[PDB]
Each structure stands twice: as C-alpha cells, then as structure tokens.
Symmetry: D2
Amino acid sequence: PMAPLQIADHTWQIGTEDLTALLVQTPDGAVLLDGGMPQMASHLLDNMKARGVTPRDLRLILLSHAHANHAGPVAELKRRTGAKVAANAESAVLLARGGSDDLHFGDGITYPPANADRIVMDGEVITVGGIVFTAHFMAGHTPGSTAWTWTDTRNGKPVRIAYADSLSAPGYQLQGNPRYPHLIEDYRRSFATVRALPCDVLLTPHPGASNWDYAAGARAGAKALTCKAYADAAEQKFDGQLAKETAG
Amino acid sequence: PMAPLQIADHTWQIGTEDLTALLVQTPDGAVLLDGGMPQMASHLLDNMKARGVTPRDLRLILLSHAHANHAGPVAELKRRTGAKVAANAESAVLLARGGSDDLHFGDGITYPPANADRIVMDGEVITVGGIVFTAHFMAGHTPGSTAWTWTDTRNGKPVRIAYADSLSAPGYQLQGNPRYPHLIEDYRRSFATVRALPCDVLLTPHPGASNWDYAAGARAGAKALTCKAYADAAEQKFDGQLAKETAG
Amino acid sequence: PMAPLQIADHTWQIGTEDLTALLVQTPDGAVLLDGGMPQMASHLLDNMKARGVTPRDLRLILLSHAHANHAGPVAELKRRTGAKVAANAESAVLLARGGSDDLHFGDGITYPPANADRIVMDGEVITVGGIVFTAHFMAGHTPGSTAWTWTDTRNGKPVRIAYADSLSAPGYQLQGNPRYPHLIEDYRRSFATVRALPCDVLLTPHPGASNWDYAAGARAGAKALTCKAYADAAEQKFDGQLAKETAG
Amino acid sequence: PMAPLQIADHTWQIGTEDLTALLVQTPDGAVLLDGGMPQMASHLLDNMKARGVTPRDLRLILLSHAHANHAGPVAELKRRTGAKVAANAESAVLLARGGSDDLHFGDGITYPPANADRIVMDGEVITVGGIVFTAHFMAGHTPGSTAWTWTDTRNGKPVRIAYADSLSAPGYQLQGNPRYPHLIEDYRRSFATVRALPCDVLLTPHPGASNWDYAAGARAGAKALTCKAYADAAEQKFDGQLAKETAG
Ligand SMILES: [Zn+2]
Ligand SMILES: [Zn+2]
Ligand SMILES: [Zn+2]
Ligand SMILES: [Zn+2]
Ligand SMILES: [Zn+2]
Ligand SMILES: [Zn+2]
Ligand SMILES: [Zn+2]
Ligand SMILES: [Zn+2]
C-alpha cells in the first residue's frame, strides 16, 4: 500500500506495492487503469486527492482485465467519483457479473459487479485531454484481457508506455477446455501481440512480472523487463505447463 | 446440510437447520422460495434430486429478500437448472448488483448477481400448475421485502401457508436515514400487513423468528407462532430500537 | 422543437413545444429532467451549449418516468456526456429494458435502454451545487413515476419548482389488472402526494396537462395550474374513468 | 407468415419468406435459431404449436447475430416460454441493449432488450437431447456474428447443416473505422471460417443470400449456394466494396 510513484510526467503508480493501479493525469481529467482489490477504494482516491485529483476529477476507468484483484473497486469508484468505464464486451459481461462464473475459477474470486459505460473494440483509441489510449486485445488470462498503450514524456522526450495484462495461466486446463475451446491459440497470439507492442516502459498488473520494484523508489524501474522479454518468459512458462500437462 | 422436511402435502424445507428453503412440488413444475446461503446449491439440488426433481424440474424461483444468506445461490441455480427468477423491482435491482450497495450494510454481505426473469407487483399471483402464489410487499428489512403466500393441503386438507420475510433490522439507523427516508413508515405498514396475512401456518426465512425447530421432526412446527404474534414481537423490538435511538 | 424557454433564473425548458425537458444550471454542473423523444439528443445538446453548458457540464439526469416520449435520448446523452442517471427501482428496471414489457403498452414503445447509476428511495434528496432536489414517488401512470422538487429564484425571489409526472391512465385497465393489482390505491395516494408539494411553480412532462404554452414566451406558464389544481384535476378525470370501467 | 418448412428430419423453417427462424426439435426440448422481427413472436409460437412444441418445450434460443430483424422477439419469447439464450460476449451485450448504439447503424434500429443466460466461447458446443450445436465465431456483420452447425438424421441418415450468419457489410465503412479498426481483418478470417464449415446444408438469416426460396416450398433450397460458394461470394463483394472505398 504505497504512496504516489512517478513513472513518467503524467503517469503515476497509485496502487499498493504489489498491485499496479495506474493514474494518468490529463488537463481534461484523470484516468484510472486498474484499481486493485475491492478494498483498495478510498486509498485510491487518497492518492488522487494528494495527486491533485478529486472524485469529480476522475474521468475514466480502463482495465487490464476484470478479476477481483485488478478491478475490485470499479463499482465503488464509479459511485464515489465522476468515473465512467470503458471495456471490451468480454471484460464487460464479466465485470458485470462480479467475476462470477469465471471460465477457470467459477465463483472463487467474485467482486461486486459494475456496468460498463463504453464498449471498446480491438485497436480502438480513447483520447483524454489530448492523451490517446490504444487498446490491444490479448485473450488468454481472460477472454477480455487487454493491453493499453500511450505515449507520455520524461525529460520532454516521448516515452511509449505499454500496460500489459498478465500472460499467466494460474492452474488452468489449457488443452481441450470445453469452456475455452481455443485457449492455446488465443494465448499464442497474445504472446506475439505483447512482443511487438510500442514499448519504452512496460508495467503489469503484478509488478513482479515486469521486474518492477515499486518499493525501490527512483530505482523501482531499473531492472524492469522489456515487452519482448516478459512475452518470451510468459511463453516458456506456458509451453512448460503445456508440456507436463500433455500426458496424464 | 439436512434432509427434506414436509410442511404440507407438497411443501418441503430443503434448506439447513438455520436457513429456510421452501420447495413446492406442482404437477406442471416445482417452485423454490429462497435458497439460503450461496454455498448451498449442491445441497439444494441434492435435496431436490432426492425428492423427485431434476434441474429440468425447477420451474420457478421466488425470494423473500435479496440478501446473501437468503438468495446467495440463485445465480448458480439458474445456470444448473431451467429455473427462472420472479421478483419485485426493488429485489430485482439488488439481486442484480449482488447484494452490493446495501442501504444498511453496503458491500458487507455480497454474493453472485442474478437477473430477474419476471418483475412482479404488489398483490400479483404466480400460478404454477394450479398452485397460486400471491405476493405481499413488506418493505423494511429491505425495500423489496415480500411475503409469499399459498394454500396447500396437509393430510389432504387446505393449509394456508405464509412465507413472511424478516421484519428485523440488524444494526439499522431507523430515523433520519437519508438512504431510506421513509423507513419507520414502511416498517409499521408491513407489521399491519404481516399480521393480516391469510395465516394458517407461518414460515419465515429464519425459523427462529416464527418459532420453528427444523431438526426436531414433526414437532418442528409445534412452538411455531402465528402471523399476529410474529409481527407483534416484531413491532415491540422496533419500537424499543426506535426508543433506544434517542440515546444515539 | 423550440429554442430554450426560461422558467426561472437558472431553470429552462429545452425540449419541444409538446415535450418537457428542463435544464437546471448550478455552480457545480447542469442537471437535466427528462429529455423528450429518443431523437432529441442533439437538439437538447444544442440548447445546453447555447446556455453555456457543454457536454462535460451535464453531470446528472433525472426522470419523471421511463416512457419513450420522456426518457428517450437518455442512453445517448449518457454516451455523449459524462452525465449520470438517478432513479427509483421501478424506473430503473423500466429504463434498463428500453420501455419493453410495459404493464399496459407491452412492446409498442421501446427506446434505447440505459442503466441508472444511482437508485433512490422516496423522499431522497440530491444536491447539485448547493441546490437540493427531492424525489416524491407518485406511482400510477408508471409504478416508478416520480415528482421532482427544487427551489430556484424567479426574481432573485425564491420560487418553489415542482416537476410532477403525469397522473393519467391512457386506456389503462384499472380495476382487476393482474399486471397492477393495486393500481387504484397507488394512484389515489399519488394525487394526495402531488397536491401538497411545495409548489409556487408547476411543470408537467406534457405541458398540455398543467395548462402551459411554451410558445407564449414571456407568459407561457401564466395560465398554468397549481399543484393542487393538477392533482385534483387528475383524480377527477381518474374517478371518471373508474366509473366507466365499473358499470359502463 | 409462412407455415413450417421442413429442411431435414427435425429442422424446420417457422419464420417468413424473407427471414429465417429455425426450429430444431430434439428428444429433450426444441432449440430455436433467430426469431426474425420483433413482432414475430406469436407467429413463431403458433408455428411451434403446429409442430408439437408447447412454450415449455422451447428450451434454448441461439442467434446468428443480435440485430432487430433477426433477434427481434427474443425477449417476448423468453417471457412466454421456459427458453434460455446462449450467445457470445459481443452478441450478449448488443442484445442486452436492444440493438442500440450499433457500431454502424447507431440507434436507428432498436428492439426489446434481452439478457443472455449463457455465454459461449468460440467453438463451444451445446448439447440438447443428444444433438450437438457448435459455435463458430465469424465476426464481421456484427462483432458477435456466429454460425451454428449441428448434424441431424435425415431419413435415418445424419446430415451436416450449417446456419451461417450474414457476411455482408451493407453501408459499412470498412477501412479506418474508429469503432472498428480491425473490421477488414475480422471479415477475412470469417470468410475462411464459413468456407470450411461442416456443410451439407447451408442456411442464412436472409434466405436469398444463400439462394433459398421459401415460396418455392419443397424446391426452396435447390439452387442454393454452398458454404464454400457463399463465403467466397461474400469475400468477392467485400473486395469490390473495399477497393471502391479507397477511391473516396
Ligand atoms: Zn486475473
Ligand atoms: Zn492478478
Ligand atoms: Zn436480510
Ligand atoms: Zn437473514
Ligand atoms: Zn408516459
Ligand atoms: Zn407522455
Ligand atoms: Zn444484421
Ligand atoms: Zn438482416
């Protein structure tokens, strides 16, 4: 449960030390990318207030994916701020039933449900205060898993920021999943997708994945990974769950 | 986990010893009034299968009120049976946001969200194979709190059976409650209603309030109270909570 | 189809000459009350800009009732603006299903559905920029039918503004209606509700019911009935309808 | 207003000349595919009676895509029968908003909204009475466009039927469409998908697009294209629509 952490000029890390919750400050208003656990709600705004943003200053909420530890407070944040939610149809029906009936977890990770305001399509752009957010679909971890890119600045120099959802598969049945018949082929597109993302700075729903150390302060992003690296790691791990899995 | 327990020719208590779950067997389908806690879906069906009812058999699902311990498994149930859900507007909206944003409890007693299939109005009857269920709104415990009544036959003779919702108010602010300006006003009107219900037998979400010993055989409904008595003991505690409210 | 019509110092009519839609401007943002027909999203939006209110400025949307000729463009207004919708449970479920499955009209008037962001109980107050709006439930025309009250100033001289919903029953089955078993007792108390509203200035969804003439510019609401007169006039019309239905 | 039209042993066209509604009767309940125009609910139910399928015998509703002239009466059906709907994320959201905020038609084509009871992934199979229905996503005409393939038993002999959704882009802006950046990419993949469908018999939302003739009765589907032909024909038109588009 950290305090505001500058990543680039208009991008800050506002979610705890082991849970990315990105704040992108635009004149036209603020933007929240993920929000952590259902309980991290007021904390989120706290960092908002000190950051200069107030509830009515919250314009938009984007998600990496609609699970409880990453979209937990979306509903509470909407009630308490000026937030509207933009998500793909997949993230949207899932956000909407509170993470319930999860392809792989069922009801083991339900949060309170929220309604989406906008339905975005793969490669759709969202401009907030002259700041353009591009959506990159990467089905795998969830059918609606998404990647968000945007160019910020550091030294005045343009910095392309890729917010990549997990490429992980926490104990999933990959081959012949009747609930997700083409899981493997989706995940494989997703690896190559992240792999080619306009990436100067990468961040991930879990900071460990990108090698980020939010506790390291000015060093929190010194050994941080590349988009390519994290991709290939994630694949080595999947082909490693897919190998062992084959027989038995 | 208990075994079914006849109450009338076709009414059975398939819940637990501490959570009512009234199963009603009609020729052209079977009704379920409340289903207790969310984790009680297997048992609910378990109890149904062991009573001459498959998933294909659950035709209807009515509820006393949209709280976790009384409507928790309805989402799961629909997904596993051909069950439809009939409920009033107020319960329907609450069912749909998973028990979140509770007037009195907030997100403290959340559960998987479900969509109502039918919206019913005060005094509306639902007939499933010749059995008439008449809806009695009794706002208070929740805005949508209802009393479901129907005639059965015990030993082959008519038994008018009232499934009155909780008239309780665990930890509520009664007056000056901005989220429920007319609370006291509604609670009073409900007692008068709960008291004038066509009452031969009285069943309630929590067996205690009606005075029912579920795990005590056919002598379970021996110390069970009347409608009148239940609302009487209901107003008494309220008027004393309203009185204990001038303090704080 | 007209240009903005001022009612009070910060309260304008912006719909059409046959359809009411009120813009209430406050130091914290605009508040809209009904919107007319689905096709009117752009007109209303013109007027608001004419009035110095930009889309970002619309923050709240209130409704008399969720019929197509009054709640029509609400869904698009939500997409085109950051406004949020507040409504009671009945009006929230009827709005969410675009008007379909009407208790009396069925599916003959559907419009783009929408989600209420906030559900409100009877007598609940909402404050926008120091101004307070109070919801008065007046069930009948629709079971969600709401009267909205606030006070402005017509001469730097406080006027009580009452926006009350229709009290009509256009071809409604009154007594014996299975979709509305208690229609008669709701209307009745609804009359007695409208009658006693704080009401210097009265407005109705249909100008033609509270004797307004949006063309009359300077006067217009000068031969306009009072709340007592409206209320009384409806039950008169109402008590005429029942009479017929009964013996006739 | 056409009487049922036998397509195979247990597959009928119960719609109209111009629009395709398929009834697949199975040991365990009947399945329906598309319903046509919003007002077509009673006609279907009538045709369903003329085939021994009572409202309670309707179990599952499937969809090509959630446009008005194909999914129009799905909500009245769900209300008048014990039928449930299975659909993908894309379709389920468009259906949940009545065909409003269309990516290409906006809100000019609106119908009663309906909730999905089940969400399917690409290539997910749904069995009803031993009969297996497989979903093939063919994103294009709508993002949620789907093709359903089942195998009947014509005259004791199985048959491989293919209900492929429209593959048209009527008036669509194909290149650089803000709401649909990967449109063209999506279609190409969808042309491929239709081409290779298990396809003895091919049927389409609009009969003519697969050159059926519902007035031709027994003839009806005699000079009717093959999946292979249909697809490539659709790709052909798409190529001309594209190139012609690039030249302003
Ligand atoms: Zn996750
Ligand atoms: Zn995670
Ligand atoms: Zn409760
Ligand atoms: Zn309880
Ligand atoms: Zn109306
Ligand atoms: Zn009207
Ligand atoms: Zn279409
Ligand atoms: Zn069509």
